[PDB]
């Protein structure tokens, strides 16, 4: 609980990763000014059930081969049942870095899908490792072609 500019500056400095310290001061001042301008523009300019929106997102996750994650989200929202905070999170959703990597059978349950999934995972591990090796090799190759003092 604080003034709108005070909390805006707090959040802006939190997000800021801020060569001279004057550059960092200028960057933080510019961030605060941009935040103030955006708030002012929105104020000068100045529905669906939130359950429906969370169902939308859960359905999308299940569609994207993330059914377990959608189930987790469903259980989270049921524990939840702040709404505007959830809406803001909804708008912010998908803004993080994308992820490319994260009794018994009845004799007919023999399925290539389980073994196929295992094979694909063991492919993904190997491939990712060789990609990391290639990328580190390329970085070193560039550095060895670079002056080295900047």
């Amino acid at each position: 609980m604080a003034s709108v500019p005070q909390l805006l500056d707090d959040l802006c400095e939190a997000l800021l990763p801020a060569q001279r310290r004057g550059s960092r001061k200028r960057a933080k001042q510019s961030l605060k000014k941009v935040a103030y301008n955006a708030l002012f523009t929105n104020l000068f300019q100045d529905r669906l059930p939130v359950k429906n929106r969370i169902l939308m997102l859960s359905f999308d996750l299940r569609v994207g081969g993330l059914a377990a994650e959608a189930d987790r989200l469903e259980e989270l929202v049921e524990g939840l049942e702040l709404g505007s905070v959830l809406d803001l999170l909804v708008q912010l959703a998908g803004s993080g870095p994308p992820r490319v990597l994260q009794n018994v059978r009845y004799g007919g349950y023999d399925c290539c899908h389980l073994s196929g999934i295992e094979a694909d995972v063991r492919s993904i591990i190997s491939g990712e490792e060789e990609l990391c090796r290639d990328l580190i090799r390329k970085t070193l190759q560039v550095m060895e072609a670079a002056p080295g003092t900047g």
Binding site: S58, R62, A70
Partner: protein
Amino acid sequence: KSPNVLLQNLCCRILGKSEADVAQQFQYAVRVIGSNFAPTVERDEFLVAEKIKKELTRQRREADAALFSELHRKLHSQGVLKNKWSILYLLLSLSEDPRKQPSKVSGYAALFAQALPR
């Protein structure tokens, strides 16, 4: 626009309720849909049409069967739909029998033909 939005609109139209008033039903529907998004068997409308004709005959509507064959010809002639198999299966699953008392002899999928999984 989005498939989930369309599903919400469909459920609203079916229930004659607001979007929020069908959330539990909508949640069940979302779980059902997310259970399977792709068909598990090959698509080929000839089998669907044959099943439709057999059902019509079982309903003692052979003239209606001929009409259905004509309409299928007309549709495929003026083809603008690329996923007919799906709509035909939907209509078949939604077909009712108002002109006769409800009773059917069981069909077979191991004696009679069954679709090869994709």
